Amino acid sequence: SPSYTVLGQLPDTDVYIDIDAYEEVKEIPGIKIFQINAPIYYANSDLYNIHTVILDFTQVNFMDSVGVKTLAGIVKEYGDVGIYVYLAGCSAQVVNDLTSNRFFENPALKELLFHSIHDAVLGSQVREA
């Protein structure tokens, strides 16, 4: 799909790239990592034993209200079955767009934000069940 890319980890590093880019790159058991390549309502359409989904926002320069609402639905619905959705690599501007569209109306959702994919992977290691 052009709207998202499945990422894996290069073994014994903090490097995450396209699962199809290099043979030894492997997904982490219990975690799905998706790089967002188009506004999230496109990726969401494709969506339509995992404890964590990590969404890599490195490529995202801004979000619109429809995108933030979509994202909120994704976080909520995974959350309802105990799966955490983490947001990695959000720029200041993207965080501003999330905030303006009241994504953090519950300040607890601030805990879903991580600077890098690896930070998010490490955040999933031990946590509130």
Antiparallel, parallel or unpaired: β 4-9 and 16-18: antiparallel
**CATH 1.10.1740.10 corresponds to the domain 1-129:** no
Contact 52, 31 (CB under 8 A): yes
Cα-flanking dihedrals φ and ψ of residue 63, to 5°?
-120, 150
Joined tokens for residue 76: 């909520």
Kindly list the domain boundaries of the chain, sorted by start residue. 1-129
Of 31, 30, 27, 22, the closest CA to residue 7 belongs to: 27
3-state secondary structure the chain: CCCEEEEEECCCCCCEEECCCCCCCECCCCEEEEEECCCHHHHHHHHCCCCEEEEECCCCCCCCHHHHHHHHHHHHHHHCCCCEEEEECCCHHHHHHHHHCCCCCCHHHHHHEECCHHHHHHHCCCCCC
What technique determined this structure? X-ray
User: What is the rounded distance in angstroms from the CA atom of residue 72 to the CA atom of residue 87?
Assistant: 11
Q: Which residues contact 48 (CB under 8 A, 6 or more apart)?
A: none
Q: In what order do the strands lie in the sheet with 16-18?
A: 16-18, 4-9, 31-36, 52-56, 84-88, 113-114
Residues in the chain followed by a break, C to N above 2.5 angstroms: 48
Q: Which residues contact 111 (CB under 8 A, 6 or more apart)?
A: none
Joined tokens for residue 111: 């805990």
Q: Residue 78: what residue type?
A: Y
